[PDB]
Amino acid sequence: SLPPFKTTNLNGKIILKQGDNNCWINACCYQLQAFDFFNNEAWEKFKKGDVMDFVNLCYAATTLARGHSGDAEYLLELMLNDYSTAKIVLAAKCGCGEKEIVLERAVFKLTPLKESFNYGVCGDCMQVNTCRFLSVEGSGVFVHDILSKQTPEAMFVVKPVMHAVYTGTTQNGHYMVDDIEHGYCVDGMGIKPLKKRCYTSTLFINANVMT
Ligand SMILES: [Zn+2]
Prior knowledge:
Layout: E1 7-10, E2 13-16, H1 23-32, H2 41-46, H3 52-62, H4 72-80, E3 86-93, E4 98-105, E5 107-108, E6 117-121, E7 128-147, E8 162-167, E9 174-179, E10 184-187, E11 190-192, E12 199-210
Parallel strand pairs: 5-7
Antiparallel strand pairs: 1-2, 3-4, 3-7, 6-7, 7-12, 8-9, 8-12, 9-10, 10-11
Residues 94-96, 122, 124-125, 127 line the site of zinc ion.
């Protein structure tokens, strides 16, 4: 066994010292700490600084060993697969007409911008559905293709509370978290200014959007 990851408790969030390529864990765990509905025996200890049970649980779920890089968005999908804490309604246009798609979930694999986008194909006309957001309610997190340029606040369909941030190669990169609600970027146990770009997720709390 190696020794436990060291921690810091910063403005209500436990954060993990950078070591052994653990940043994907840190990024995911920092987001889970935003959801008061998320819980279990190993998480109750993590919230207090006693982090190795849950951290070990993250390696088990992903089949990865301590020391290997991973994917913070994949890990959020795993841990949140049995939660359903938000509702998103889309309008979907194809050659048959227009219809609504209802998604109830905690993690959504969608881009969180208020523009038009494709999602699925209609099995009666075989065209791709051209889609747009009609509403978002509750709490949850979008996991998404990297937004690598700044995004005007008015473009997000929801008000972001925080974003996983990923810089570098898909091979050789590094995770951090833009904590928008606090005003800084968390990078290991340290603090940096918001990167404002490079975002791989978008977390929202108590959404109540009509568009
Ligand atoms: Zn159709």
